[PDB]
Design a protein around this ligand. Structure first.
Ligand SMILES: Nc1ncnc2c1ncn2[C@@H]1O[C@H](COP(=O)(O)OP(=O)(O)NP(=O)(O)O)[C@@H](O)[C@H]1O
Ligand SMILES: [Mg+2]
Length: 509
RNA sequence: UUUUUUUUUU
């Protein structure tokens, strides 16, 4: 299908809620809702996408816009307008399906729909239900039946689950599907699910298999997502609306980026602790920060250290996929409202989540994928605000920083070295209550995570894996101690004959 | 000795 490029341009007439109202694109009721939010104007992506999304042209839409620049309302505004345009047709049926890669992001998008409802009670007739995992299935279906929503927001697993059982009842009249964080939903492990969802929706559609229009949004995407999305895009024309220059870096330019390079992976923990201690002092505890880590087990470990160091100064919140869904939701609600605190998380919180007035994004080690560097740091500097980010890595992770320059055109000007004092090491290690078996589990989780991104980040396997493994000895304060394991385990790892495996493990079987 | 998410509360 034909991809039509509409690139970023300089002096082009500003689009406003009024001008869209005056020109007949937006109805009074949706103009009213958004006006009462009292935004200075419409963001660039909103100005660019609202009219094309609503145009009677038979096209799909792809939109690129930097983190924190209002992509959510860029799709919700025209979705509401479509619901108004067709209000007497199939009024009890789902007309728009929005899919997100995480439950908390799905729930956030729903909360934003509810804000529109709150600014104009006349829009409540266009009801919304979220379909996400870790929530009661029956309670959610009771809500579908009671409210007969025109808008569904969902994560892929639970959406497929509902569709296999109830696609005929609610989903035969869908006109739009939206992939938020589209590039993420089209990677391995979501792409097949999105193809399944798209196939069901197209097959059940009462008008035709090509009826549904598809909208893709992300801060990180290009021409190549069209290829990846080929089986889910129905229309013969695809509009690519871009608010970023072709060669311009995708990272938000307002973020003051830096990297702190240690000799050892474990030293990044000490660097981060000292950085946080200094920020708490200098800002008189007026400090709101998010710190990312590579694995669930390590995030949990890092939370223990940060609580021991900083619980007296700031709240420390632990956010990952093994936290119960009730707690994930309640902690997201709190950190959205709070003026200060530290959110410690995995890449579950890398994309989409909008926590106002975060001062800094910190990262210990590398993201779960290259693009997530851009999304991670984009948790700060949202809707016009300032922000900073610090990447704490060790020397053997430097090829990641080179790949950021090579692949994404991101050059971090501020780079410095770090070496921990014996004082900080003692302070951090002595409060660690984890048993050796727990430290082993934690470091093994890191070995696995790093092993999986060696090719993508161009690491040297023979250097990076031993360095990650050596964290075990560092944390037990004995640097020639290796991780005790079984031969059966080493065989499973595929390192039984490797000198790399010999440098990491001791067969204490 | 589940590497990040993502139905199984249908
Ligand atoms: N026109 C506007 N003017 C000012 N703020 C806005 C506007 N539209 C939305 N916002 C706010 O901007 C913040 C970020 O919007 P959001 O839609 O989450 O960004 P996004 O582009 O999806 N970011 P990401 O998902 O991180 O790539 C939210 O707090 C919105 O309320
Ligand atoms: Mg978003």
């Amino acid at each position: 299908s034909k991809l039509i490029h509409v690139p970023k341009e300089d002096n082009s007439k500003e689009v406003t809620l009024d001008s869209l109202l005056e020109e007949g694109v937006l109805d009074k009721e949706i103009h009213k809702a958004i006006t009462r939010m009292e935004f200075p104007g419409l963001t660039p992506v909103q100005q660019k996408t609202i009219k094309p999304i609503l145009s009677s042209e038979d096209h799909d839409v792809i939109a690129r816009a930097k983190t924190g620049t209002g992509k959510t309302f860029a799709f919700l505004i025209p979705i509401f307008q479509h619901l108004i345009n067709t209000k007497f047709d199939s009024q009890y049926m789902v007309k728009a399906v929005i899919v997100a890669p995480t439950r908390d992001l799905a729930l956030q998008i729903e909360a934003e729909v509810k804000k529109i409802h709150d600014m104009n009670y006349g829009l409540k007739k266009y009801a919304c239900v979220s379909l996400v995992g870790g929530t009661d299935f029956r309670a959610a279906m009771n809500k579908m039946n009671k409210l007969r929503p025109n808008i569904v927001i969902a994560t892929p697993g639970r959406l497929i689950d509902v569709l296999e059982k109830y696609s005929n009842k609610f989903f035969r009249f869908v006109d739009y599907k939206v992939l938020d964080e589209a590039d993420r939903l089209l990677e391995i492990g979501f792409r097949d699910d999105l193809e399944t969802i798209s196939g069901i929706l197209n097959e059940k559609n009462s008008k035709s298999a090509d009826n549904i229009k598809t909208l893709l949004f992300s801060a990180t995407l290009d021409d190549k997502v069209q290829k990846l999305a080929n089986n889910i895009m129905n229309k013969k024309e695809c509009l690519f609306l871009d608010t970023v220059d072709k060669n311009e870096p995708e990272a938000h330019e307002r973020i003051d980026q830096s990297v702190v390079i240690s000799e050892k992976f474990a030293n990044s923990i000490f660097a981060a602790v000292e950085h946080i201690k200094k920020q708490i002092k200098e800002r008189d505890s007026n400090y709101k920060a998010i710190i990312f880590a590579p694995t669930v087990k390590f995030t949990s470990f890092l939370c223990s250290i940060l609580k021991n160091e900083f619980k007296k100064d700031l709240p420390i919140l632990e956010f990952h996929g093994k936290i119960t869904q009730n707690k994930r939701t309640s902690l997201v609600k709190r950190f959205k409202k709070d003026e200060s605190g530290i959110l410690v998380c995995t890449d579950v919180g890398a994309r989409g989540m909008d926590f106002p007035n975060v001062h800094e994004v910190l990262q210990i080690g590398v993201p779960s994928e290259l693009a997530n560097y851009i999304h991670r740091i984009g948790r700060t500097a949202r809707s016009g605000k300032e922000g900073s980010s610090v990447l704490f890595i060790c020397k053997d992770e430097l090829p990641f920083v080179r790949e950021l320059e090579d692949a994404k055109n991101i050059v971090i000007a501020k780079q410095e070295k770090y070496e921990p004092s014996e004082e900080i090491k003692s302070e951090v290690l002595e409060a660690v209550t984890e048993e050796p078996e727990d430290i082993s589990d934690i470091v093994i989780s890191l070995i696995s995570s790093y092993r999986s991104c060696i090719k993508e980040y161009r690491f040297s396997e023979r250097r990076i894996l031993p360095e990650i493994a050596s964290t075990y000895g560092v944390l037990l304060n004995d640097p020639q101690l290796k991780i005790p394991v079984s031969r059966r385990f080493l065989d499973k790892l595929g390192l039984s004959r490797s000198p790399i495996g010999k440098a990491m493990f001791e067969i204490r079987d």
